[PDB]
Amino acid sequence: EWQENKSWNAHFTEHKSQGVVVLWNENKQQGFTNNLKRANQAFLPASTFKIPNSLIALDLGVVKDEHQVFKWDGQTRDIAAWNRDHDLITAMKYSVVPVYQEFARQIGEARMSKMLHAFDYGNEDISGNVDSFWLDGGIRISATQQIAFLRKLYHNKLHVSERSQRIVKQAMLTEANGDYIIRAKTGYSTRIEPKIGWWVGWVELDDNVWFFAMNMDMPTSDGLGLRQAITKEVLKQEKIIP
Amino acid sequence: EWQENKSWNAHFTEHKSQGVVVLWNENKQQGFTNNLKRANQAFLPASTFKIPNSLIALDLGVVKDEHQVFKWDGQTRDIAAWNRDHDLITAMKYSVVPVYQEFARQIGEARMSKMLHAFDYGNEDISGNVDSFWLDGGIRISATQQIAFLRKLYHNKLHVSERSQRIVKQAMLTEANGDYIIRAKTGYSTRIEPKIGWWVGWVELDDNVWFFAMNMDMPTSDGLGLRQAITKEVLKQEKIIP
Ligand SMILES: [Cl-]
Fold first, then answer.
1. What is the total count of domains within chain B?
2. How far, CA to CA in Å, does A183 sit from each of A108, A110, A175, A192, B179?
3. Which of A93, A170, A176 comes nearest B175 by C-beta?
4. Is A174 on the interface with B (CB under 8 A)?
């Protein structure tokens, strides 16, 4: 069941922004959003694709464990954090595209396509460069589809090993305190209009889990922090977090 | 190699307290403490024993997974947080002794003894009530021994399944942000003098891990927050965290 709560638009308007936030109460099995249409609108996943990419890479042995070092290829790139060695944990934390482009090439398009079908991931279309299709290729997914995918991951019900799903959920760790735990992943699609930013994941509470998926128009990189800020304002409004 | 930093005693004295803080730089394989003598002094583990107890219960199947509900036994206790259903995550978070006492009874004395010897855990002496020996029994462990045990857990080198060690490290999650992750467990020994408080765990950074183990005299519960405060205060002085 899905209910539309348009009052969340205040958080977008007050931040000179436009987008969608989708929430899912696991205990009640009930979803909420401010925009039904945009919640089901299909976008490029961008770096949110690092979640399924990690799962496949781990299960195929392309990645041994979360501490296997992937050496810098020496090429200086704009993002200074990319110009260094990384493991799975830091590669996720800093959204290091080049490391995951190497994962995709070793996975290959054949295994990438077939294993993404097992996840029921978006339109299941990887047409484009095997190492950039989630950035300028044919793959598309909606916020509600992110939720469905994330719920399977949380419950270890994706068709990969439990170990791989545990490692990725560890690598998704973003914030934790005495009130909640957030496991999530940011995204930032810029190669194909409209430019947008993602934040998908869930909030773990003592007695419930709140899955979330949001995307918003991102004409400039100045507003990237609004992906998390607007989400936390919805969470606060619903008394999910203090 | 071990170096003594007596300047950290300022953090204990200024709080009208006495104790030890032990740190271990994993990358450099170097330990630091304010009191070499007390760093090797053995105490009752108290609720810090919930770490090995969780490992044993998981590995033996006493606990299915981290979300298996353990129903309240109906008995009202002083700590209100104990008077409710718990899973492994919340049982750790709120140090629910009674839930872990039932684990110990189901593990049994023979399997408990064998597993602690495999862990090289303290003096490996479980004499006393099988469901309270870590509170008023014969088992003893020092701050340096806590580190050594925790390092095995971090590296999945303990003699249990990798899954068991991953679940417990998940259950140990205490704090996480863009700067560090803390996985730890508090302790509070009161049944046998001297009353003390524990905090054992480690700090995960991008490029290093800092294991820590601290205990301090705890004549009254007024100073339980000093377990984390004094630890985070040494970490601050040593430029480990902001
Ligand atoms: Cl975790």
1. 1
2. 28, 30, 7, 27, 15
3. A176
4. yes
B76 Cα to the center of ligand 1, angstroms: 31
CA of A177 to the centre of ligand 1 (A): 12
B46 is in which domain, residue-wise?
Answer: 1-242
In angstroms, the CA B22 to CA B151 distance is: 13
**8 Å CB contact of B175 and A174:** no
Buried-exposed string A2-13: b where 16+ CB fall within 10 A, e elsewhere: eeeeeebeebbe
DSSP state of B81: G
Helix, strand, coil percentages for chain B (3-state, nearest 5): 40, 20, 40
What resolution in angstrom units was achieved for this structure? 2.1
Question: Which CATH number characterizes residue B230's domain?
Answer: 3.40.710.10
Tokens for B131? 């469901």
Q: How was this structure determined?
A: X-ray
Chain A residue with minimum CA distance to B69: A207
Name the DSSP letter for residue B195.
Answer: P
Tokens 């509600």 correspond to what residue?
A: A144
